[PDB]
Amino acid sequence: KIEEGKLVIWINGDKGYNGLAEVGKKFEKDTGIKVTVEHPDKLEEKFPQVAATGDGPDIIFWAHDRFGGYAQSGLLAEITPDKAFQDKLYPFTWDAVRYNGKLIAYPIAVEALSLIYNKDLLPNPPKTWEEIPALDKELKAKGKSALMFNLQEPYFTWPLIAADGGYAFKYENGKYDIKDVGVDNAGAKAGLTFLVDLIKNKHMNADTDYSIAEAAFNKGETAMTINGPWAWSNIDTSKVNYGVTVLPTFKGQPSKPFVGVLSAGINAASPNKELAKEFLENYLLTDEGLEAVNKDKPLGAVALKSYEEELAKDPRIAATMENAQKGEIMPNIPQMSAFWYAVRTAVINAASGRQTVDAALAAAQTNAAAKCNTATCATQRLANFLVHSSNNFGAILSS
Amino acid sequence: KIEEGKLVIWINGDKGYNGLAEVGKKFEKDTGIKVTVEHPDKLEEKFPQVAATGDGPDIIFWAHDRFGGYAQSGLLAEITPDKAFQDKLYPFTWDAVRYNGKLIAYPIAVEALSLIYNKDLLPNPPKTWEEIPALDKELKAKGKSALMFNLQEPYFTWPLIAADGGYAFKYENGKYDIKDVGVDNAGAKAGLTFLVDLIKNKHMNADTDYSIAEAAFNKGETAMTINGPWAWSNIDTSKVNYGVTVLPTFKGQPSKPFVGVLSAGINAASPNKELAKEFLENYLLTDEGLEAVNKDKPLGAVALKSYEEELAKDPRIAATMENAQKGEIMPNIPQMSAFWYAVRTAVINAASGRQTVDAALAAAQTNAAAKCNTATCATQRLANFLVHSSNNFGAILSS
Ligand SMILES: OC[C@H]1O[C@H](O[C@H]2[C@H](O)[C@@H](O)[C@@H](O)O[C@@H]2CO)[C@H](O)[C@@H](O)[C@@H]1O
Numbered sequence: 001k002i003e004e005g006k007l008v009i010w011i012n013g014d015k016g017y018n019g020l021a022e023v024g025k026k027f028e029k030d031t032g033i034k035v036t037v038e039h040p041d042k043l044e045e046k047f048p049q050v051a052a053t054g055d056g057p058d059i060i061f062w063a064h065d066r067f068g069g070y071a072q073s074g075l076l077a078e079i080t081p082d083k084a085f086q087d088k089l090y091p092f093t094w095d096a097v098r099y100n101g102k103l104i105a106y107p108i109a110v111e112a113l114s115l116i117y118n119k120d121l122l123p124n125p126p127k128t129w130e131e132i133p134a135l136d137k138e139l140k141a142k143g144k145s146a147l148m149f150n151l152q153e154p155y156f157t158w159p160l161i162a163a164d165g166g167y168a169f170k171y172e173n174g175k176y177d178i179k180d181v182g183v184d185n186a187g188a189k190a191g192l193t194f195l196v197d198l199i200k201n202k203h204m205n206a207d208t209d210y211s212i213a214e215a216a217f218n219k220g221e222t223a224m225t226i227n228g229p230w231a232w233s234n235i236d237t238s239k240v241n242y243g244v245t246v247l248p249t250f251k252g253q254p255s256k257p258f259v260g261v262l263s264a265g266i267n268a269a270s271p272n273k274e275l276a277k278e279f280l281e282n283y284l285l286t287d288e289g290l291e292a293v294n295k296d297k298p299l300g301a302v303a304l305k306s307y308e309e310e311l312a313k314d315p316r317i318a319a320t321m322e323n324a325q326k327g328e329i330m331p332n333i334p335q336m337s338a339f340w341y342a343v344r345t346a347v348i349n350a351a352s353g354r355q356t357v358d359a360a361l362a363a364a365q366t367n368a369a370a371k372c373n374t375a376t377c378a379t380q381r382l383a384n385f386l387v388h389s390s391n392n393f394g395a396i397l398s399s
Numbered sequence: 400k401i402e403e404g405k406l407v408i409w410i411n412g413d414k415g416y417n418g419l420a421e422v423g424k425k426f427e428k429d430t431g432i433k434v435t436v437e438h439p440d441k442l443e444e445k446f447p448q449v450a451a452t453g454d455g456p457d458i459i460f461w462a463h464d465r466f467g468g469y470a471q472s473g474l475l476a477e478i479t480p481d482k483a484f485q486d487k488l489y490p491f492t493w494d495a496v497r498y499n500g501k502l503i504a505y506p507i508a509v510e511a512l513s514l515i516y517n518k519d520l521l522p523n524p525p526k527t528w529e530e531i532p533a534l535d536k537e538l539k540a541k542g543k544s545a546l547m548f549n550l551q552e553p554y555f556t557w558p559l560i561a562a563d564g565g566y567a568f569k570y571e572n573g574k575y576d577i578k579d580v581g582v583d584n585a586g587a588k589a590g591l592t593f594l595v596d597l598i599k600n601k602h603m604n605a606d607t608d609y610s611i612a613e614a615a616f617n618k619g620e621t622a623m624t625i626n627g628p629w630a631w632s633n634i635d636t637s638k639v640n641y642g643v644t645v646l647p648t649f650k651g652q653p654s655k656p657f658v659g660v661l662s663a664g665i666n667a668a669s670p671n672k673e674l675a676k677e678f679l680e681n682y683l684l685t686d687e688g689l690e691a692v693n694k695d696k697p698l699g700a701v702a703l704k705s706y707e708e709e710l711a712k713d714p715r716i717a718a719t720m721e722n723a724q725k726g727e728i729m730p731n732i733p734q735m736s737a738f739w740y741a742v743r744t745a746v747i748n749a750a751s752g753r754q755t756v757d758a759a760l761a762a763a764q765t766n767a768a769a770k771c772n773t774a775t776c777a778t779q780r781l782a783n784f785l786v787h788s789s790n791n792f793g794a795i796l797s798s
């Protein structure tokens with residue numbers, strides 16, 4: 001099924017897969033082990049479909065939120081980095097890759113969405129969501145729009161939904177209560193209603209996706225976009241004069257983006273687990289390896305202390321971490337797949353006008369929530385506290 | 400050594416030891432086992448001395464702060480209640496009696512100090528410490544005084560010392576740094592200076608102890624005192640019309656009392672551990688058992704949910720919990736002994752004029768601070784997070 005003496009890697013197509021392929025080439029040059037990097041469509045859905053019967057890649061990269069589900073299904077090898085290696089990465093990042101108390105992936109970098117704006121069109125970007133409609137009116141008369149971002153993935157709309165009170169699964173006292181979903185409270189309704197009204201009032205199009213928003217911003221047709229570190233390098237090439245800053249407030253509250261830790265897991269069925277460990281620990285998670293990936297598409301705030309110290313002075317990373325501090329770490333519980341699936345459908349149905357905000361979010365609450373909560377082991381409860389600790393996250397924040 | 404076929408219990412003399420002896424009589428009726436309740440002076444210092452020689456009581460009652468030291472020293476038997484019993488008490492109270500992964504006592508009640516005032520002498524209690532001098536001046540002209548409280552035990556002066564920034568051990572990210580004490584910072588100096596100034600300006604006396612303050616308040620000789628729930632029954636008998644309220648603010652900041660969980664530990668040297676467990680679970684931690692103790696001297700907010708629901712109606716308990724929310728849970732680390740010794744010494748020396756506030760607190764820092772910072776095991780780091788969770792604690796104060 002999976003080939004012995006070689007490595008296959010899956011990583012998302014928005015990441016620096018060519019940079020990662022360069023790291024694979026250095027690995028092959030030094031060790032003779034071929035590394036093949038692929039970026040399949042819907043890889044986060046395909047992985048569980050293929051790993052169950054011993055197929056799929058040796059190493060899978062994704063934000064940490066999906067890994068709990070994968071671990072629960074028996075798809076991931078427990079990783080065993082030694083103490084000396086663990087000490088090289090920020091503790092917070094290790095805490096984000098624990099499931100049932102075991103380390104189930106190597107953390108790579110911390111991601112959060114920021115407001116990206118065209119400094120020539122918009123020297124003083126808006127501090128609030130409320131002022132965007134008027135900004136869009138002014139710009140439309142000059143042949144431009146105010147804001148375009150991916151409306152097809154709920155990750156991008158979440159910061160606005162969470163701003164005034166929306167939440168996924170209630171986190172409290174080291175545990176996530178899967179009975180208690182906050183996608184249909186007053187805050188979530190207010191946030192999604194604001195988005196839907198932007199669309200009704202012709203300030204945004206319900207069909208806008210990642211590629212459309214990126215092309216619009218990068219060609220100078222829209223003054224702002226919402227995106228993560230990975231997007232910066234294409235903007236660099238476009239020569240649009242851009243800034244990266246704090247997301248706008250809504251009802252006076254900060255936007256609250258979900259925080260992701262890009263992570264690399266090892267397939268439980270891989271016969272190359274030690275080659276995977278060697279590649280990840282000794283090639284990728286080095287200054288040189290991370291630089292290779294980062295130069296392709298920026299990673300955000302990297303888990304490796306030594307390299308983060310170099311990246312810390314970048315204002316764009318400062319903005320990323322400011323937005324992250326205002327947001328919250330994604331849960332990694334197996335119920336996250338159902339949550340994302342339910343919220344994606346609700347946002348698209350409401351933005352399209354097929355459903356009211358209230359009906360869409362009521363359905364999403366029902367479909368995301370479990371009927372009753374379950375047990376959390378002590379080592380995991382500790383991990384949960386640690387990823388909710390500002391002082392723990394602060395080790396990276398100050399860099 | 401400890402006598403087999405009998406239970407000796409130690410409890411502090413301010414508590415309901417006669418009520419506890421009544422629970423003992425019921426135990427004796429059912430089991431044939433005589434229960435002797437004693438209330439030795441400075442029992443929290445005597446226990447570790449006598450228990451280290453295999454002597455002492457079968458069961459020791461004290462606030463949870465001293466129990467980490469006792470457990471570390473090997474003086475306490477591990478508690479293993481079954482899930483059915485555990486579910487009867489608030490989780491937070493169990494979390495307070497964990498030490499390095501083991502339950503080392505049965506929790507009984509949550510204690511915090513409050514401001515107690517004579518409503519006939521003082522209908523409107525002061526919101527600030529700063530207004531007490533002027534208040535004392537008016538009352539001295541009427542043959543009374545404003546405030547008397549125990550200045551001999553640092554437990555009672557700590558809320559003022561901590562108000563403007565004083566702290567015991569620096570607490571961050573689930574861990575205490577025992578090298579970093581806050582008994583000699585600007586906030587601690589300000590608080591102790593204010594107390595010492597009250598004495599210098601003849602608004603308080605340095606020799607005022609527990610007995611002097613209680614007698615003066617209950618005989619109507621002074622207008623206010625500072626004390627815990629246990630004191631309310633003697634005030635009831637005195638017929639003084641009293642209120643229990645929030646502690647005064649200092650420099651605009653809440654007074655921060657240390658919160659204690661009265662707990663019952665089993666002596667590791669006891670040959671009666673199974674009897675002691677049965678006494679505690681099946682006789683004391685019942686509605687009827689806690690009622691007997693509480694009717695003698697109030698316990699505070701009890702750990703037993705069924706009885707706390709019955710006591711939550713009392714405004715004096717609400718006040719106790721408001722003060723606790725403003726304060727901090729006591730650490731249970733072994734170094735707490737040295738901390739209390741250090742602050743006890745400083746307050747007495749400053750109040751007597753034996754040393755200046757600065758010199759006393761300089762010595763306290765040296766006496767309280769460890770030479771190095773020990774590790775924190777993962778189990779205790781978790782318990783630390785749990786006892787600092789406002790949602791965890793909130794389950795009680797909602798009652
Ligand atoms: O939209 C739901 C989606 O959100 C997150 O995915 C992000 C990912 O974390 C970023 O690295 C990036 O590639 O954009 C994605 C959104 O398109 C969750 O990680 C994911 O599981 C979820 O389905």
Ligand SMILES: OC[C@H]1O[C@H](O[C@H]2[C@H](O)[C@@H](O)[C@@H](O)O[C@@H]2CO)[C@H](O)[C@@H](O)[C@@H]1O
Nearest residue numbers: 411413443462464465552553554659739
């Ligand atoms: O004053 C230092 C002393 O403070 C605490 O003791 C309290 C105790 O918690 C209450 O239950 C009560 O009886 O009043 C005591 C003060 O007299 C700490 O628990 C203790 O270890 C410390 O020595």
